[model samples]
Target: MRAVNWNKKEDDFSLMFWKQNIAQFWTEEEIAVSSDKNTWVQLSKEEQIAYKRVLGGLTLLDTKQGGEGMPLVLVHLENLQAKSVLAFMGAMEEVHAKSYSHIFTTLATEEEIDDIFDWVDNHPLLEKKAGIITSYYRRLLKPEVTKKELYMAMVASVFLESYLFYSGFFYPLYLAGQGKLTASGEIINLIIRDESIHGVFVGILAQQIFAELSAEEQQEVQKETQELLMELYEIEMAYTEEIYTSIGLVEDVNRFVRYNANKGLMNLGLEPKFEEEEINPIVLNGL
Candidate 1:
């Protein structure tokens, strides 16, 4: 067996990625929340509810990712450098969950905050999406799973990191475009950069494994990915409609979600699942 070198990684690309990820490390507290605090009460009741609920849903997903999902997936991987990078990503996911809490505490009553978590638990679309992602990771825990199954789980992580969060990202960006809750928007922007790298790196890892599969297995994985994307897109549409209809931003938000789904597909080096759509000028501005 060859001895492992932690430092002299001339051929390991993942070591470079790990170095870059560490260099960019930050905490949620470093962002300025004062501006967001001042603007929270200024929004309409519906807007407030929509924002909080969207964040609550995001929080649930991040919580699962950090506390359960990443760690579980990490155990199944063999690359030392990649595992190190993933461990950092898992910690960042926890930071994201805490950042949402930071926003909630700044704007909500203690009781109201409780309601936000409750909303995530009861929301039909959010619950369904979260359940499916949880199951994907959990299935990988079985000792007899194949390499292709593992590859799909990594793809699922990319999906959550990239596409699943876009609808939740819409409101913050929209509000930021209007020059409201910009402090929170800044935090979302930071998280966006983090997830972008996460998706890309994980996508690369998945694609590398995918290349080793037989033609039939490749077709199966592709079919499953396309089906999962379509399913997620539909769920997000209903979610956006329910959240943004009262504020009259449903159409714009859906457009943004579709744009993000395409972006996610591109990160995975896959064909776009939806026809080209422009991001709303307002949401476009926030990024």
Candidate 2:
């Protein structure tokens, strides 16, 4: 095994990100989510359910990132610096999953927690979204993976890190903008900062992989990326409708998802799939 020598790295871009990620390190316990306890009671029925279910959906995806996504990519990575950065990403994913549990424990009753868990398992749109992301991660574990498959997997990873989490993120920030769940929103801000870094690094990594492909392969992969992005965008719209429709934030939430999807494409060095639209100021304030 090679020793981790931070001094030596071929990819200074990744090294810089690794250093920043470590420098900004935090955990679920460090953030005082207890403040949300009282805020929980004051939330409307729509806000309460939206909060729990949104987080419940995010928790499932983060669990996969921690357990399946990052580790799968790590095994295939040859560069020590890149592997180290991704490993930290894996650990952060776990921290994110734990943060959700932390929030639930602070703000939800035992019955409500159980219900949230149940909703995570039973909600078709949530499960379908989870399954779609999982399929991409799982493809990497095959015995004889190609560079093309690997690039696509990294693209999937970027998609997850960049595009998938924002809809759910809307809630904590929305409530926080109204001066409720401010502490939980702070925790989410930390998580978003972490994820933003992840998205950038993974997107760069995917671009590196794309650089190795032939012109024909590049065209094929680009087509695949375009299709997958569109499909995931539609999936996110469905998820937004499910989570935000009842609470009357569907249009605003969809705008946030679209804006972030554009950000994700730019991070990948690809053209955006949507026109640039400003995110709702209230939602942006939550960030």
Instruction: Write down the RMSD of all candidates, one decimal each.
Output: 1.7, 1.4
| Per-residue C-alpha lDDT of model 2 across residues 210-283, encoded as one tens digit per residue | 99999999999999989888888888888888788888999998888888888888889988877788878887
Q: Report how far off residue 89 is in candidate 1 (Å).
A: 0.3
**Residue pairs with backbone overlap in model 2:** none
The local distance difference test score of each candidate is 0.84, 0.86
Question: Model 1: per-residue lDDT, tens digit, 243-271?
Answer: 88899988888887888888778877898
Q: TM-score of model 2 relative to the true fold?
A: 0.96
lDDT, candidate 1, at 112: 99
Cα error, candidate 2, residue 56 (Å): 0.3
Q: Pick the lDDT winner.
A: 2
lDDT of 1 at 253: 82
TM-score of each candidate structure, all chains considered together: 0.95, 0.96
